Amino acid sequence: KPKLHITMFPWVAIGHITPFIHLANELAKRGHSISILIPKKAHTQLGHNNLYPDLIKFHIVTVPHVEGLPAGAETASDIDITAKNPLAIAFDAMYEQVETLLYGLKPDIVFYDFADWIPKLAAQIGFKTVCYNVICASCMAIGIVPARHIPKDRPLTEEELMTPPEGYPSSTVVLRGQEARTLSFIGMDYGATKFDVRITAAMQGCDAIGIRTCRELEGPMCDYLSAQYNKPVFLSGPVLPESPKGPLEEKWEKWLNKFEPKSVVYCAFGSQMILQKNQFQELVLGFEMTGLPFFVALSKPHGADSIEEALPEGFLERVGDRGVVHGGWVQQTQILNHQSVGCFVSHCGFGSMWESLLSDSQIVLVPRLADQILNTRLLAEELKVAVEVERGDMGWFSKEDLCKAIKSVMDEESEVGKLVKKNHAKWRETLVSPGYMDNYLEDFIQQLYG
C-alpha cells in the first residue's frame, strides 16, 4: 500500500506541538509524509527536532493580531492568563490560511486537537481526521463527555467538578474536594466559545479519537470515551522520544558514586513548573528531614536571585554533602539510570511518569495539575506502584508529609515500600519488553488505514 500523507495542525502551545512532532517522527520513520503547520516562533524553537527532513515538512501559519493580543504573541508561552481569549480567537482566525494550505497539501488524514473547525474543512476538502490528545484519557473521560452536563451560562460548582460523569469507569481515579478547582478549566471561556463546547465539537467531528496512551494503563477510560462519543479510539502509545545519549555530567556521576546503590533520592518537577518560595523552602526542608542523600533539580522561585538566596537560612551548612539543590537543567534519564539513585520524587508529569515507570526507582508523586493528580491516583491508588504525598488546600505540601512518603518507600523495613516495588517491577517488565512500544505504533498506523 502507498504511504500516507498526514497533515498536523496542533494548538499553539509548546506542550501540544512537541508531542505531535514526536508522533510525526515515528510516522516518518515508517515512511509516511508529514506536514506540520505551526507559528514562526515555535518553528524556530523546535526546528532541530525534525529527524526526517525529507518526509517531515514545516509550513508556517501566521497568528493574526486581534483585539487584545500582545504584540509578537504566537504561542501560549508568550501570553499570561489575561490574553487567553485573544490567543484562542487568533487561533480560530487562522482557519482560512489552514484551508488554503490543506487545498494544496491534499492530505489523506489531518491530526488536530483544539481546532474544532477542522472537520468542517474535512468535508469541504475531502480528508479524514483524527482528534489526537496528548493529555491523559482519564482527564478527557472524567471531564468533557456527553454524560456530564455543563451549563453554558454559569461555571460548574466544586461539587459538580468533584462528581464523575455517569458511567465513569473508576472509583479510584477521581478528584477529591480540594482538587476540584484543578478541573475547572473544562468549562472556562476559551475565545469565542467555552472550552467544553470546543472540545465536544472536536470529539464529535473527528473520524477517530487518538490518545497518547496504552491499553494496559488506561483501557477502561478509552472504552468509556469510545462509547460516549460513539467513535473508534486509536492508541498511539506514549510515543516517548529517544532519551538523551552521551555521558552523564562527570561531577554528578562522581558525587552520586560517593553514595551507596539505590540510596539517593532524585527530585524534579518537569520543565514548566516553578515553585513559590515558601513551598520551595518547605520542599528542601522535607528532603533534609529524611536524613537520606538527595539530588533535587528545581528552578529557583520567581524573582529570586539564586537558589541559595531562596533557600532557608542555615540549610546549606547543615546538609553538607548529603544533598544537592541545583537550579540548572540536568540529564534526568541518565541520573535515573545511575545505580546510586533509588527514588524519584516528581509531579507525575507525562514524561516523568513514564520515566519513573521504566526505571527501577521507587516512585513518589507530588502532583499539581488535574492530569498529574489523576495519573497519581492511577499509579498510587489503582496500580499501587507508587505513593502519593498528602497535600493541602492549594496543593500545598508540608515537609513532614513529604518526608514520611519518601521514608515509606525507602526503608527496607517498610511493608508499603516492598509492596510498591514489587508492583512496580511487574509493570516495568511489561512496559520494557521488546516490541511493546512498536506494537502500538504499528497498530495505530494500521488503524489509520481503515
Ligand X SMILES: O=c1ccn([C@@H]2O[C@H](COP(=O)(O)OP(=O)(O)O)[C@@H](O)[C@H]2O)c(=O)[nH]1
Binding site for a copy of itself (CB under 8 A): 119-120, 122-126, 146, 152, 192-193, 197, 200-201, 204-205, 228-231
228 binds, among a copy of itself, ligand X, none (CB under 5 to 8 A by kind): a copy of itself
Length of the chain in terms of residues written: 450
φ, ψ (nearest 5 deg) of residue 387: -120, 150
Type of residue numbered 382? E
CB of 40 to a copy of itself, least distance (A): 25
Nearer to ligand X, 295 or 440 (CB): 295
50 binds, among ligand X, a copy of itself, none (CB under 5 to 8 A by kind): none
Nearer to ligand X, 337 or 414 (CB): 337
Nearer to a copy of itself, 229 or 266 (CB): 229
120 binds, among ligand X, a copy of itself, none (CB under 5 to 8 A by kind): a copy of itself
333 binds, among a copy of itself, ligand X, none (CB under 5 to 8 A by kind): ligand X
Nearer to ligand X, 329 or 436 (CB): 329
125 binds, among a copy of itself, ligand X, none (CB under 5 to 8 A by kind): a copy of itself
Q: Residue 8: enclosing H or E segment and its boundaries?
A: strand 5-9
Number of other residues whose CB lies within 10 A of the CB of residue 78: 18
CB neighbour list of residue 70: distance below 8 Å, 6 or more residues apart: 78, 79, 83
- Cα-based angle 402, 408, 413 (whole degrees, multiple of 5): 150
CB neighbour list of residue 232: distance below 8 Å, 6 or more residues apart: 208, 209, 226, 447
Q: Can you tell me the distance from the alpha carbon of 423 to that of 379, in angstroms, rounded to the nearest whole number?
A: 10
297 binds, among ligand X, a copy of itself, none (CB under 5 to 8 A by kind): ligand X
CB of 148 to a copy of itself, least distance (A): 11
355 binds, among a copy of itself, ligand X, none (CB under 5 to 8 A by kind): ligand X
Nearer to ligand X, 103 or 329 (CB): 329
Question: Would the CA dihedral through 335, 284, 311, 277 be positive or negative?
Answer: positive
CB of 107 to a copy of itself, least distance (A): 13
**Closest residue to ligand X, Cβ-based?**
349
CB of 197 to a copy of itself, least distance (A): 5
| Cell representation of residue 288 | 533534609
| Cell representation of residue 384 | 499501587
Residue 177's SS3 state is coil
Q: Residue 56: enclosing H or E segment and its boundaries?
A: strand 56-60
| CB burial string 179-205: b at 16+ within 10 A, e below | bbebbbbbbeebbebbbbbbbbbbbeb
CB of 249 to ligand X, least distance (A): 12
293 binds, among a copy of itself, ligand X, none (CB under 5 to 8 A by kind): none
DSSP one-letter code for 294: E
Q: Can you tell me the distance from the alpha carbon of 388 to that of 394, in angstroms, rounded to the nearest whole number?
A: 16
Nearer to ligand X, 66 or 330 (CB): 330
CB of 403 to ligand X, least distance (A): 22
The contact set with ligand X (CB under 6 A) reads: 268, 270-273, 297, 329-330, 332-333, 349-352, 355
